[PDB]
Amino acid sequence: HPETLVKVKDAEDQLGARVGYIELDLNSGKILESFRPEERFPMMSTFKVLLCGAVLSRVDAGQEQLGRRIHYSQNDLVEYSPVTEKHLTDGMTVRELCSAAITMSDNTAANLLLTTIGGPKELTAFLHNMGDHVTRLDRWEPELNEAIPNDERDTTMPAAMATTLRKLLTGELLTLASRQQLIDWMEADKVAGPLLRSALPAGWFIADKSGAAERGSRGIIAALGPDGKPSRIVVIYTTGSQATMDERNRQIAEIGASLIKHW
Ligand SMILES: *[B]([O])([O])[C][N]C(=O)/C(=N\OC([C])([C])C([O])=O)C1=[C]SC([N])=N1
Ligand SMILES: [K+]
Ligand SMILES: [K+]
Ligand SMILES: [K+]
Ligand SMILES: [K+]
Ligand SMILES: [K+]
């Protein structure tokens, strides 16, 4: 609804930085509303969902096992690894690593998973192979969060990310069991409270993944809908703002409140 674009454009005004947005019908794939849908924005941690998508694809093909255990060390740890820093002694399984990467946005967990698939180059090849000729991962944690202005490395477009998430959650790309595992991890997301979740009505469903990076970068991808079932996909990205993390969270939350009100 146009009233939500009032809030989205107001957000760009208030943050003094570009905001990208897109609301997509989950079933039909129809773009319901958008703003700067085909401009690039740093993906930040939202790529962790595509990473686990690639891992689940390998699992389905018999090239990976969710129960496989990976051992790592203190020197493997990078900034913000709330879960992995607690399992140095006995390691973690691939499944436990995706849970940490998606639900807590654990950076070391993401790097360990990236390593299992061949690195950023292979995640990007996986994406292109499934029809996303825009989204690209080029670096590892922490560098992929640099958000250099005009840099295409580690970026996506709101439209491309929405379509990709749609295929990942509902297409034949992944088996039913695997696609459910992916959305189960997103639904259990624990670090995106101040965002869309703060505007979700009682009884509604949401599976999401947030992101934060340098230069005011913030964003979130989500599948949400009434009566415990997702029916639309929402993608919101912003970069360039000098606003505080709270101000950025509030704007995303207010965009959420508007799209819910006009559902
Ligand atoms: B992903 O985008 O969620 C990974 N994000 C981060 O590692 C960064 N911040 O995450 C914490 C510390 C949890 C936060 O408070 O948002 C991050 C990387 S570069 C930067 N300025 N922030
Ligand atoms: K509409
Ligand atoms: K429209
Ligand atoms: K160890
Ligand atoms: K330990
Ligand atoms: K900063």
Query: Is residue 183 in contact with ligand 1, taking CB distance under 6 Å?
Result: no
In the annotation, is 23 catalytic?
Answer: no
C-alpha pair distances (Å), 160 with each of 29, 69, 129, 220, 254: 12, 33, 13, 14, 23
CA distance between the termini of the chain: 8
Atom of ligand 1 nearest to the CA of 105: 3
Please report how many Cα atoms fall inside a 13 Å half-sphere around the Cα of residue 233, on the Cβ side. 26
Cα 99 to chain centroid distance, Å, stands at 13
C-alpha pair distances (Å), 137 with each of 42, 123, 145, 219: 10, 7, 11, 16
Return the structure tokens found at 101. Answer: 């990467």
- This PDB structure is determined at a resolution in Å of 1.9
Burial class (CB in 10 A: 0-12, 13-18, 19+), 260: middle
Query: Is residue 212 in contact with ligand 1, taking CB distance under 6 Å?
Result: yes
What CA–CA distance (Å, rounded) separates 114 from 110? 6
Domain boundaries, the chain: 1-263
Task: Give the active site residue among 3, 38, 85, 143.
Answer: 143
Instruction: State the CATH architecture for 1-263.
Output: 3-Layer(aba) Sandwich (3.40)
Q: What is the 3-state secondary structure (H, E, C) of the chain?
A: CHHHHHHHHHHHHHHCCEEEEEEEECCCCCEEEEECCCCCEECHHHHHHHHHHHHHHHHHCCCCCCCCEECCCHHHCCCCCCCHHHCCCCCEEHHHHHHHHHHCCCHHHHHHHHHHHCCHHHHHHHHHHCCCCCCCCCCCCCHHHCCCCCCCCCEECHHHHHHHHHHHHHCCCCCHHHHHHHHHHHHCCCCCCCCHHHHCCCCCEEEEEEEECCCCCEEEEEEEECCCCCCEEEEEEEECCCCCHHHHHHHHHHHHHHHHHCC
Technique behind the model: X-ray
* Ligand with smallest separation from the Cα of 218: 1
